[PDB]
From a paper:
Overall, PIM2 shows the typical bilobal kinase architecture with a constitutively active closed conformation. In PIM2 both the Asp196 and Asp198 side chains form salt bridge interactions with Arg162 from the catalytic HRD motif, although this side chain was disordered in molecule A. The activation segment is also stabilized by hydrogen bonds formed between Tyr194 and the main chain of Leu188 (as well as His190 in molecule A) and between Asp192 and the side chain of His190. The most significant difference between PIM1 and PIM2 is the absence of the C-terminal αJ helix in PIM2. The structure of PIM2 in complex with the (R)-enantiomer of compound 1 shows the perfect fit of the inhibitor to the ATP pocket. As designed the metal centre does not form any direct interactions with the kinase domain but plays a structural role organizing the organic ligands in the three-dimensional space. As expected, the maleimide of compound 1 establishes one hydrogen bond between the imide NH and the backbone carbonyl oxygen of Glu117. A key feature of both the PIM1 and PIM2 complexes is the close contact of the CO ligand with the glycine rich loop (the distance in PIM2 between the Gly39 carbon alpha and the CO group is just 3.1 Å) in which Gly39 together with Val46 and Phe43 in PIM2 form a small hydrophobic pocket for the CO ligand.
The serine/threonine kinase PIM2 is highly expressed in human leukemia and lymphomas and has been shown to positively regulate survival and proliferation of tumor cells. The presence of a proline residue in the PIM hinge sequence (ERPXPX) removes the typical +3 hydrogen bond donor of the hinge backbone resulting in considerably high Km values for ATP.
Author numbering: 32 to 69, 78 to 106, 112 to 288
């Protein structure tokens, strides 16, 4: 492999653009420190291999190799939703619907593999601009799905679910749905719903004028304070806004 220009830096490590020497394929090399992250390969590798077995969702980026330096696939041209929205603004409900079902099926697959992404947000959805195809990146904070709940959260406060704020505990699915909730809101609205803890635990949603009733309805379904109240992946797919 040949590394190239930087793409982004941060707590997720450092992702460089690069290429595979033999076939000149465009790849991304994510560099992770040993004691500043979290056989005996990193969890992230373990997870991506389970996810990448057979073939991805295929809205999940695939790990090509690991050395810590993880060589993953890199669509060209690419851009993440966060930056997408920042340049274009809210997506429209047509497009949003489009990406959103993509994203849910991506996740759906991971769950079948037994992986939970645990940090679904605009930054961690990669848009292949040529194929208009959203792809789930960064399993740095993800973990193995199980019955037992999780007592650790790497996400930002504003993205956290009310049961994390409330009890420092959350189950995979209902937390995932929340995140999708936030995600959907982000796309259609052009920014996240909640800032302060009062609002998250209250689920105080004030929609702008253009969000279709049918849309709003699903967001509110997903941003239910009670975890039980929240829909499941399958049901989100049936939801009236998601059709057509």
């Amino acid at each position: 492999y040949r590394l190239g220009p930087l793409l982004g830096k941060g707590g997720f490590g450092t992702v460089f653009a690069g290429h595979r020497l033999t076939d000149r394929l465009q790849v991304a090399i994510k560099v992770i420190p040993r004691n500043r992250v979290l056989v005996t390969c990193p969890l992230e590798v373990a997870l991506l291999w389970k996810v990448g077995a057979g073939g991805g969702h295929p809205g999940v980026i695939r790990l090509l190799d690991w050395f810590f330096m993880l060589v993953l696939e890199r669509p060209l041209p690419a851009q993440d939703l966060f930056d997408y929205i920042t340049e274009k603004g809210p997506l429209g409900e047509g497009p949003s619907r489009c990406f959103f079902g993509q994203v849910v099926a991506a996740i759906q697959h991971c769950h079948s593999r037994g992986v939970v992404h645990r940090d679904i947000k605009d930054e961690n959805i990669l848009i292949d601009l040529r194929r208009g195809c959203a792809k789930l990146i960064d399993f740095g904070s993800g973990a193995l799905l199980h019955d037992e709940p999780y007592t650790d959260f790497d996400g930002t406060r504003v993205y956290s679910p009310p049961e994390w704020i409330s009890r420092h505990q959350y189950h995979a699915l209902p937390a995932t749905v929340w995140s999708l909730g936030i995600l959907l809101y982000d796309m259609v609205c052009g920014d996240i719903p909640f800032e302060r803890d009062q609002e998250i635990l209250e689920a105080e949603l004030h929609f702008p004028a253009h969000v279709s009733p049918d849309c709003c309805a699903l967001i509110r379904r997903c941003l239910a304070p009670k975890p039980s109240s929240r829909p499941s992946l399958e049901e989100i797919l049936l939801d009236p806004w998601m059709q057509t």
